[PDB]
Design a protein around this nucleic acid. Structure first.
Lengths: 111, 144, 185, 56
RNA sequence: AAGGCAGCAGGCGCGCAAAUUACCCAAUCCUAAUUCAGGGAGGUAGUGACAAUAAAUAACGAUACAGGGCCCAUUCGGGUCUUGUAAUUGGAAUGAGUACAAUGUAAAUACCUUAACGAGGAACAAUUGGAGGGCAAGUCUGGUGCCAGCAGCCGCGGUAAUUCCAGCUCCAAUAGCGUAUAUUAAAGUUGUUGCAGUUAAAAAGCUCGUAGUUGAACUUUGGGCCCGGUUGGCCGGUCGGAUUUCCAACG
């Protein structure tokens, strides 16, 4: 993955996995790019990572009741102030990049 | 056929005909009339220093509706008066009357640029320092 | 009034500046060879374009032209000696097929890596410029040395370098020094 | 939108339908609303047979 | 009474625009009555991002989360296949610099050597322009509201700005990068190669006519050797045509 073998496996061969990535370079990651096909080929309704039961309730207070506001909090994570609004109690589909920036900007280790 | 002479002893006609039709070319004429020396405000130079006379506001032409914040400048070596655009915002505060600015061409080799009507020049340096430095707070304008 | 010094530049910028084919063809030439910047790649294609201009000039001339024969063998044996033209490929129709890849192979920054002892292609670059590799008897710290055919048996660590013996350098020397003043006495 | 909707029309055609049609209307990818329609087969919408053979 | 730096160094002025009032005859050569003297010729050093060459800003390791697809599944699991985020640690190597020395040199400086110091994110910290298209790289966030401004060109901005001002992220070249003017390619948009002229720009209203440019056809085949035919026969093989060989010369 990351330097574990990609130099160790390059012992005088120099070509194993040298193909190009998907190619956005500013559009966000493909953490659900596998799930996007599954919801496309499955001809029924599937539930999209339903809710945020306690990572909403407990982590809204630890983040925002400390010093901050969501208008401030969404500004340092670079999202609209309604995105954090639907991460407060309920009513969101949680994606990884937004929830990662939510964690590393205010420390509370609940994923 | 083809309307031009072709005979082997006809080099004079082709050479004089090329010469006469070179004058239809825009830059060949200016190279051989010396229009840069006599007619252009800069004396055929990339840059010229000037003296600021007044701050100007020029209405941007259609379909833009801004005010362009340029100045009127009199050159040292010629005495001619040109209008020069003052670049990105706040720079008109950095320029004042009688600051001895430095001018450059405005990009299009003697033509106006963008929505500004009748401005062929821009300010580069004011009071001898820069405008990039003054805009980015890298240098300070001398007290004058 | 002293006679001038001749000089020239050894590279050329490509015509179209922003491609997605040429700009991403630097996957090999910058990551798979461990290079500084595109000027090291523009340099190779300049010499390689210099080669084909001479070769195209010769092929236009008649076969058994004394000029074609003289500068032909000279161009071959120069390219044979550095190992960019293979052992029997010796024909002017094959120097035109010569591409950028088998020039960066002959660089000392890769020839160190292929001859063991480097464990990465840009661990070798660090070792060369830190005055560790000597060719024959001569320390070289130029990663673009372009080794010859009778030189691959002579890439080895320098007689002065810590990895070729000779009293290891100021990091281990000082590191062993503080254990001497803490554990020894 | 174009993938979610062509995956519905082709499933209904696989199910032995003679024609179906899917309309998506709203602000699809811009600030000014448009309407995209995706169809296959044929549909009749004229009269009493609408009450018989059309489901909406 | 005295003068002539478009000699060397320097100053003023002019400007967009250009270096030290330094050291020496040791090299290159010159002159003289001449091996010795003299030489701002010339050389050495200082200033010097004019151009040009080479190529530092790190290299090896160890350590982890969070998903998603599929498979088997008890449901608690793996067992692959991939997606992103770093984050804490270790010994090794080196010169940029500070310098005994020696070397270099007319004497020095610097280079090339080299004792002694000289790396853990705080530094010994790389910038310059860009991210709608041309043209590589964000429909991420905050501010503004046809204002400020951007924008070579098309265009952006009038209350959800991928284009302004910012933060983050990313792209391009890189000790260099942007801007201005000129010039060359692009430009078969100067056309000899090689343009176009009915309607896009362009056939003089028409004819004569000197220079200029251009101008129908016609005037004999000695060296030899190999190859193809076309005539001339010695030769028909054959039921009026069918193969070619040895020999001329016929080009």
């Amino acid at each position: 993955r990351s330097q574990g073998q990609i130099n160790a496996a390059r012992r005088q061969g120099l070509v194993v996995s040298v193909d190009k990535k998907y190619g956005s370079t500013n559009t966000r990651g493909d953490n659900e790019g596998q799930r996007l096909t599954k919801v496309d080929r499955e001809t029924d309704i599937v539930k999209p990572k339903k809710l945020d039961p306690n990572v909403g309730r407990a982590i809204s207070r630890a983040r925002t009741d400390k010093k901050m506001s969501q208008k401030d909090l969404a500004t340092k994570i670079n999202e609209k102030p309604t995105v954090v609004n639907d991460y407060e109690a309920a009513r969101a589909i949680p994606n990884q990049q937004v929830l990662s920036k939510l964690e590393r900007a205010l420390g509370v280790k609940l994923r | 056929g083809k309307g031009k002479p072709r005979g082997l002893n006809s080099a004079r006609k082709l050479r004089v005909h090329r010469r006469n039709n070179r004058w239809a070319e825009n830059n060949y004429k200016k190279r051989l009339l010396g229009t840069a020396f006599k007619s252009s405000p800069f004396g055929g130079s990339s840059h010229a220093k000037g003296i600021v006379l007044e701050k100007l506001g020029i209405e941007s032409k259609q379909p833009n509706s801004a005010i362009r914040k340029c100045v009127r400048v009199q050159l040292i070596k010629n005495g001619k008066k040109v209008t020069a655009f003052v670049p990105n915002d706040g720079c008109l505060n950095f320029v004042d009357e009688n600051d001895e600015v430095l001018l450059a061409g405005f990009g299009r080799k003697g033509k106006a640029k963008g929505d500004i009507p009748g401005v062929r020049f821009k300010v580069v340096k004011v009071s001898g320092v820069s405008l990039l430095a003054l805009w980015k707070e890298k240098k300070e304008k001398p007290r004058s | 009034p002293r006679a001038p010094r001749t000089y020239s530049k050894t590279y050329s910028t490509p015509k179209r500046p922003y491609e997605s084919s040429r700009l991403d063809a630097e996957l090999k030439l910058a990551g798979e060879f461990g290079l500084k910047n595109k000027k090291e790649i523009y340099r190779i294609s300049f010499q390689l374009s210099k080669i084909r201009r001479a070769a195209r000039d010769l092929l236009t001339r008649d076969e058994k032209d004394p000029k074609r024969l003289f500068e032909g063998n000279a161009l071959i044996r120069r390219l044979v000696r550095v190992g960019v033209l293979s052992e029997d490929k010796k024909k002017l129709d094959y120097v035109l097929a010569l591409k950028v890849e088998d020039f960066l192979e002959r660089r000392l920054q890769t020839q160190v890596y292929k001859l063991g002892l480097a464990k990465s292609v840009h661990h070798a670059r660090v070792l060369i410029t830190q005055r560790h590799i000597a060719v024959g008897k001569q320390i070289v710290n130029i990663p673009s040395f372009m080794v010859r055919l009778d030189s691959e048996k002579h890439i080895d660590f320098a007689p002065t370098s810590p990895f070729g013996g000779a009293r290891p350098g100021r990091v281990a020397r000082r590191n062993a020094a503080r254990k001497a003043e803490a554990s020894g006495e | 939108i174009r993938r979610a909707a062509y995956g519905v029309v082709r499933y209904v055609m696989e199910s032995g339908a003679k024609g179906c049609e899917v309309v998506v209307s709203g602000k699809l990818r811009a600030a000014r609303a448009k309407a995209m329609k995706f169809a296959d087969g044929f549909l009749i919408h004229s009269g009493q047979p609408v009450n018989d053979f059309i489901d909406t």
